[PDB]
Ligand binder design. Structure first.
Ligand code: NA
Length: 151
């Protein structure tokens, strides 16, 4: 949505940035990229938001509410219905806090939480194997530049 995406996520991203040390525009850029500027929603079975902008799956460790999404595979001429549980967050703040908490709790991402710029962080992330793109930093860095042009 035409820069409303920032109006929605900018404050929670900043607060998570300040909690974790992860650069503000990095978080925002990852969200903007992995949700298509927020156009990809993961809604609960009743249409309500999950606020789960990174599409994080729900595990046994997750104690919160969840939503199940049904997709389909046409394999061996059979139509297999597969279900996937996603975390439901209270707010975009909980969503982004859940994300950076993970980052904080794993030394493989030390370089992100002490990065001086967003672009440095995007580089530290690529190293650590995030997204398993070896040219990940570049995808993200263009998005970051686009976020900064807006701020
Ligand atoms: Na944290």
């Amino acid at each position: 949505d035409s820069k409303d995406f920032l109006a929605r996520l900018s404050l929670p991203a900043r607060l998570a940035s300040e909690q974790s040390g992860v650069p503000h525009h990095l978080i925002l850029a990852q969200a903007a990229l992995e949700s298509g500027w927020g156009q990809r929603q993961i809604l609960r079975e009743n249409g309500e938001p999950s606020y789960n902008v990174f599409g994080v799956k729900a595990t046994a460790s997750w104690k919160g509410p969840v939503t199940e999404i049904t997709t389909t595979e046409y394999e061996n001429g059979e139509a297999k219905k597969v279900k996937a549980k996603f975390r439901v967050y209270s707010s975009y703040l909980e969503a982004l806090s859940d994300y950076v908490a993970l980052l904080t709790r794993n030394p493989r991402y030390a370089a992100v939480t002490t990065a001086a710029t967003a672009e440095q962080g995007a580089v530290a992330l690529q190293n650590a194997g995030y997204a398993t793109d070896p040219n990940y930093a570049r995808k993200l860095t263009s998005m970051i530049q686009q976020l900064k042009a807006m701020s």
